[PDB]
Write a protein that binds this ligand. Sequence first.
Ligand SMILES: N[C@@H](CCC(=O)O)C(=O)O
Lengths: 69, 674, 86
Amino acid sequence: VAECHLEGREVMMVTSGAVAFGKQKLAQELLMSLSMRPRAAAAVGQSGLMSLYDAMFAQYGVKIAQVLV
Amino acid sequence: PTFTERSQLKYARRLVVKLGSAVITREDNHGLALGRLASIVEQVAECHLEGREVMMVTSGAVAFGKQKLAQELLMSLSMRPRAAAAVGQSGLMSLYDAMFAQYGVKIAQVLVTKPDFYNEETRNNLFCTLSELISLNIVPIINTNDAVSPDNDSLSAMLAAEVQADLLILMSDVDGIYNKPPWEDGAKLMHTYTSKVKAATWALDRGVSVVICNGMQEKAIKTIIGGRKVGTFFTEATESANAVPVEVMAENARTGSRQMQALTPAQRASAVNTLADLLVSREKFILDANAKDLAEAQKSGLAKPLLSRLSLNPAKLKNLSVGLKQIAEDSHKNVGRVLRRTRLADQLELKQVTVPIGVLLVIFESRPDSLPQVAALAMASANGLLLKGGKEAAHSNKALMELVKEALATVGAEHAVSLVSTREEISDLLSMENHIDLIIPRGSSDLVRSIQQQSLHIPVLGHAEGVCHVYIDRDADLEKALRIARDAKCDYPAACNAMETLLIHEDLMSGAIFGDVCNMLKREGVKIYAGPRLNQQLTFGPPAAKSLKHEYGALECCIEVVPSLDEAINHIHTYGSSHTDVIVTENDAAARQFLGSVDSACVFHNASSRFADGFRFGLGAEVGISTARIHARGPVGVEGLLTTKWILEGQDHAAADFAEGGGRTWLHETLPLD
Amino acid sequence: LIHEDLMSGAIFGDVCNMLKREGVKIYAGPRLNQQLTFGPPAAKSLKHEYGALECCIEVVPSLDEAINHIHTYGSSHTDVIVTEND
Ligand SMILES: N[C@@H](CCC(=O)O)C(=O)O
């Protein structure tokens, strides 16, 4: 994607599946709650995933900006 | 809601913050003021780690993104807002993540908008998201979905509403709400309360406690959670009249002073007579009241000083009655008395007279015996008076207060007296101004010390340290000094006017009188230390004194010896609090030497430090012991509460009339003063 | 500050004339603002300070009212009374 953009074409990723990010990131509180007791994990994963994309893309110098719809 | 007073605020389990768009951006909206933001996140992490539940609502992301680009906005404003806020949203989120995680707490961005509260299915959805979050020890940051946006405060309010949160904190730039625009006399910062204002009403209408603080104020949360009077608190609970918050008290008292101003001739005299009569007539009520409150104190078992002084016996009441009758009979010509009578020129008759001070405020620990004494002082001195005791005696204080309110009601009838109970927050009390004149602390070192450390920009009568000194000269009779110091220490060794030191001529180490007085102190069981020079002197002797500027109160007395008069003088000035001292000798040359050289508040010659009682001076009933360098030294009677006021009754005189034009010259003839 | 009665004898006008003679930028008190048609401009704030040739002027009904205004605004610095009743 960074390549096709650096070429000069115009791209707008639509990354599905943030839930997995957050699900992994907690991995402890879901553990301790499934013994004493989904979307929220996706919210926290949304944050983290965004950061990760920022790091990686910026390593090509391109900048990004989260958009929610 | 349910909470009513700032006292209740240690008991809210769910909190919501909403930082303002001005507390975080620096004074450009073109960057980020960080220190404030850091303070905020630290306080928030604290309140959460406590176990309370918090959901920040950080406004103002635009500044983050605006700074982060700073280059493309540059290159576009030469070839050509919300987008910057989106990118800033991302970055700001990361930053919060780093910082919060440095306390171990985790967070999770959440985006909403005002329409998202209006439809009900989304209400369900978002509330489910929030509950699932809070259940997991996560602090969601709640920004608005700028993306869908044409100051986000209504948002936080109605958020707390849907959540039905305990307390909504709403930080901001302004300190609080005033009575009126600030460019206006009477900008009374309305701490409680019977734009932001509307939204606050709204949230209150949703059964929600709201508070609006100032961002720049440190520890604002930790401050406001304590119950401290800060920011602006909102509740119409309006339980009681609670006649004065703090201040209409003060103005009233001013009015009452103005009132009694026109009641000198036997008026206040007969009034305090009436007070003494009420004291000696209805004592049963107040006696049982103190018995009750003393029993209440017993289960508490606070302090044998307190647990001893809060006592009261009808003998004490007889003492108070005779003291009050004395004050009455002798308090005849204290006010209005003229001090100068002079004529500058024909029909130019200046004279300077006696006038009250104004709003006196006493402070003392539970000792209801003093209360009527100082009340008699006020009333005979025709000036207003406030009061604040401690915790105990409170009911006794009320009884005495009613008695004295009656007593003043007879003539003049104006209640130029009050009482500030229910934990008025002494520091806040002294934070006032423009009303109170003389802080008259009365309890003990602590009390007065805490005061002097807390008091700022307000006159504070009284001292804090009782380091006195006793010099003994080479030509002083031995047994004389023996009995003298014997009493000086062993009459009420916990007094203020005590000799926590004893200085002796170098010569008299030879006559073993040092040994004799050590024997005497032992007789009385006095833990004595030694001076560095004394440390050098003997083999091991008594142990070395810790510090020369220390205080004992109990049966302890440092002892040190120096060569000469002048050396003693210098040591005094170096360590003495200029409070009190005495010399014992038979040379009057040296006597006068000392007399002058000394700079104590009061100095004696062959007498006892325990003489500093004012009453002992025939100085009427004392009010305090002042060591300040102005207006008052040590034993202050009533006249330490009287200032002067120049008055002048000309006929047709003017300023330039005494210039070369008008035949007006100068006489300054000291008329016989009345 | 001037008694309310003496607004009738136009002495207010006389002293305005005098201040003009001396070139004194005078303001007016809220009560005085109410009093005349437009007159001198309204005083900004009663607890303000001028130093230069300026002097707010205001009139109140009674002695005691004046006293209260003084205590309200006066810095307890200095004052004088002019009258013939002792
Ligand atoms: N966006 C506005 C409200 C928009 C509206 O619904 O009128 C706010 O957050 O205060």
